[PDB]
Amino acid sequence: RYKPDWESLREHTVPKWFDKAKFGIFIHWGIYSVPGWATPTGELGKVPMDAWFFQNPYAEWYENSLRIKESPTWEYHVKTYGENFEYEKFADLFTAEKWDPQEWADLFKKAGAKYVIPTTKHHDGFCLWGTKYTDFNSVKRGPKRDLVGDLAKAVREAGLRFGVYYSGGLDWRFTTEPIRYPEDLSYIRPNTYEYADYAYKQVMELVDLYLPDVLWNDMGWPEKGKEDLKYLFAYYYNKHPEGSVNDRWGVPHWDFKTAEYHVNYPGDLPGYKWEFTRGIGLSFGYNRNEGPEHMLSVEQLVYTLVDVVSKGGNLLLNVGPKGDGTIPDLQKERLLGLGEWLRKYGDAIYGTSVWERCCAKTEDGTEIRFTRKCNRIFVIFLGIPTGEKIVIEDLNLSAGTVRHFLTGERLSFKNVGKNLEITVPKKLLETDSITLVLEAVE
C-alpha cells in the first residue's frame, strides 16, 4: 500500500503507459461553449498580463470576462443575449442535442491520441456529471445527461485511457468579483473550509465513479484542503496504481509537470516527465471568432508534437466543442491531418525515449529533433529538405548504418568534421510527408 504521506507517495512515479503514449486530447466543454466567444488576442505568455483578463482569448473564461463591465465580452453579451441574461442561464441552453460520444472517441483514436481528458468542472463550477454535491450539473440541467460518464465509456470502448480535468483552484460559484489582474488570484478564491471539503468530495466522487487514469487539477488546490491530498492520492493509487496526477495541486507530489503555450515550455530536455498543453487555436473553450489565421496548421501540429516528444513530454492538445456537442470542422481537419502523419511515422514517436540531445539543425537551418528506441535513433527534420546533400551541424554518428525511415533504404553518410553529411535521393525525399525521417543505428 501507498501510505497517506509525501515520503510514501514519492514511491509512485509516472506510469509506463503515460510515458509511452505521447499524445492525448484535452476537451474544454461546458456552458461557456454556448456563447462560444472571445477576443482572440494572442498566446498565453505573449499577451501583457495588464490586458489579459480584459481581452481574454480563453473563451471558457466568459463568465469572468462578463463580470468585467465594458470588456468586449460584456458588450457582446448584452447585444446578443441581453443585460438580464445571467451566465448560469447558459446551463439551460447547453443541451448537447447532436452529441455522439462514440463519434468523438473514434475521431480521437483516428487522430492518433492515446488518452482523453475532459473538463469535469471548469472555473464556472458547472459539473458535467451527476455529482451529488451540487445541482449545477449536466444531469439536472442542460443535457440531462452524465457527459463525463458517457464519454468515459466511449473513450474506453475505443481502447483509449480516460482522465479527468477538475478546477480545484477556482470556482466562480463561490465568488462574485472577477479576476482583472494576476494579483487578484491571490485573494479572489473560494477560501472557505466548505469549498475545500467540496473539492475533495468531488474529486473523490470522480475517483469512485470513474477511476480515471489521470487526475488533472488546475489552478492549485485550496490551502485549507492541501493536506487532504495525501489521503486522496493514497486512496486513488491504491485503487489504481497505474493512475497519474499532474503538478497543479501546490503540494509536494506529482507524476508529471505541465507547460501551457509559452508558460513553462522547456528549451531542452528537462529531466522529468512533462506534458505541453494548448488549444488548436488560442482558446480552450470553443471560440466562434477564431478562423484559420488563429489555428495551428497540420504541419505546425506535427512540429509541435515532435519537439515536445523529443524533449520527453506528451502533447495534450485541446479540442473545444460547441454547445450542441459537435466538433468544429476547422478542429476536426487538423486532428485528422495529424492522425494521418502519425499513422505513417508513429514508430518514431510512440513508445520512444529521449536521446542524448533533443535537437540539431541543418547547415541551411532545417531544425532536427531526435527520439530513441533502444539502439535505434530516429532523426526527424521539421520539414523536407529540397536537395539531396544534407549537412547536419554539430553532430557525429557512430552507427555505421543510417536508413531512410519510410523505405528502409540504407543511405550514404560520413562524419565530416564537427558535422554529419548524408545523401538522400530525391525519390525518397519525395515520399516523406511533412517530415524527412531518418533512422540511425549504432
Would you tell me which residues interact with ligand ZX6 (CB under 6 A)? 28, 58, 60, 218-220, 248, 258, 260, 263, 277, 284
Instruction: Pick between residue 74 and residue 231 the one whose CB is nearest to its own copies.
Output: 231
149 binds, among ligand ZX6, its own copies, none (CB under 5 to 8 A by kind): none
For residue 416, the cross-strand partners are 419
At its nearest, how many Å lie between its own copies and the CB of residue 16? 11
- The Cα–Cα gap between 36 and 30 comes to 10
Instruction: Pick between residue 189 and residue 334 the one whose CB is nearest to its own copies.
Output: 189
Instruction: Pick between residue 75 and residue 442 the one whose CB is nearest to its own copies.
Output: 442
* Geometric angle at alpha carbon 199, from 197 and 201, rounded to 5°: 65
- The Cα–Cα gap between 234 and 231 comes to 5
Instruction: Pick between residue 235 and residue 265 the one whose CB is nearest to ligand ZX6.
Output: 265
- The Cα–Cα gap between 46 and 67 comes to 24
- The Cα–Cα gap between 380 and 392 comes to 12
- The Cα–Cα gap between 412 and 103 comes to 46
User: By C-alpha distance, which of 243, 215, 328, 323 is closest to 279?
Assistant: 328
Query: Are 99 and 8 contacting, i.e. CB atoms less than 8 angstroms apart?
Result: no
At its nearest, how many Å lie between ligand ZX6 and the CB of residue 424? 39
219 binds, among its own copies, ligand ZX6, none (CB under 5 to 8 A by kind): ligand ZX6
CB contact set of 230 (below 8 Å; sequence gap of 6+) = 4, 5, 6, 9, 251
220 binds, among its own copies, ligand ZX6, none (CB under 5 to 8 A by kind): ligand ZX6
SS3 state at 386? coil
**What does the binding site for its own copies look like in residue numbers (CB under 8 A)?**
1, 3-4, 6-7, 10-13, 176-177, 181, 183-184, 186-189, 191-194, 196-197, 200-201, 208, 224, 228, 230-231, 234-235, 238-239, 241, 247, 250-254, 257, 270-272, 374-375
Instruction: Pick between residue 255 and residue 260 the one whose CB is nearest to ligand ZX6.
Output: 260
CB contact set of 293 (below 8 Å; sequence gap of 6+) = none
Instruction: Pick between residue 209 and residue 429 the one whose CB is nearest to its own copies.
Output: 209
At its nearest, how many Å lie between its own copies and the CB of residue 214? 17
